[PDB]
Design a protein around this ligand. Sequence first.
Ligand code: OGA
Ligand code: MG
Ligand code: NI
Ligand code: ZN
Length: 331
Amino acid sequence: AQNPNCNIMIFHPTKEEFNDFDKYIAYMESQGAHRAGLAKIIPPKEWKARETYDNISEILIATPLQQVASGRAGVFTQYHKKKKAMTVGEYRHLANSKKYQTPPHQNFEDLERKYWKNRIYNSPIYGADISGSLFDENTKQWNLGHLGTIQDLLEKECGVVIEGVNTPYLYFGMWKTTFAWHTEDMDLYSINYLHLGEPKTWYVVPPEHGQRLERLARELFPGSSRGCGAFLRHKVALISPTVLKENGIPFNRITQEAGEFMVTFPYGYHAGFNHGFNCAEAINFATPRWIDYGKMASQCSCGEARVTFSMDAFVRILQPERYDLWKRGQD
Ligand SMILES: O=C(O)CNC(=O)C(=O)O
Ligand SMILES: [Mg+2]
Ligand code: NI
Ligand SMILES: [Zn+2]
């Protein structure tokens, strides 16, 4: 069995190997990369996402989100307070202001310490989930707006033809902006490219041990657990590495830098934070190996998780017994 310790693997494809996306995902899985829940892919030196970023300040962040925490430093939830619209140029200046900027630090480890000590005491503002792309249309390799669609994958594997679309999303971050512990919708893969700026630190639980994280989360967030049998779908709960280690939860960590891709694998729980002003692009995707994970994915029916249009068909086809209850939670 490849990668039996479930370590995060780092890949360096050549320009030739970067042509065929599906083939390279399958290669990484042949080497056991999925067992970690997360992999890093460093593009060949010949590749570029686009020519320059010199012209992005006019993108609008229609609904910036202030991430307000409650709890203790290592075990907290966050809620998103909506803020007035602002441009990427305005948001960058805000991220760099004395109130929000990255503090002085020695290295990524010191910064990680400072994040887990102090996160709860601040409310950083995140531009998340913005439909769009920063890949040049002429970038042919690993262009996250040109991937094979999940609808097409389901049609190819299972024969069924469904409505829905699959487009990328932009994320503009600042120091302490936080992504809560989650798996993807329908336990899909994700791919995330850090276009520019400061790093992103990731934490991940191997898929084979995801239920260990769920059981700890039920213990740590007991009211939330009574409210919903899949409350991690709400994407609000944070648990620190120290707390994970105290409770014996297997996990790994890695820091993504500008120019790098990360892939999350089906049912790989992940969480993390941004180091400073940055911009990422991410999209969900599927492969044949996903289908069994999609059939078994948990679902939130309490009403909180509210998701895209395209998840309807995935539930309806892969999980027809759950469909009626889940759709009630959507409506
Ligand atoms: O970058 C972020 O804020 C969160 N991204 C992801 O959870 C992802 O790419 O799957
Ligand atoms: Mg612009
Ligand atoms: Ni994710
Ligand atoms: Zn719920």
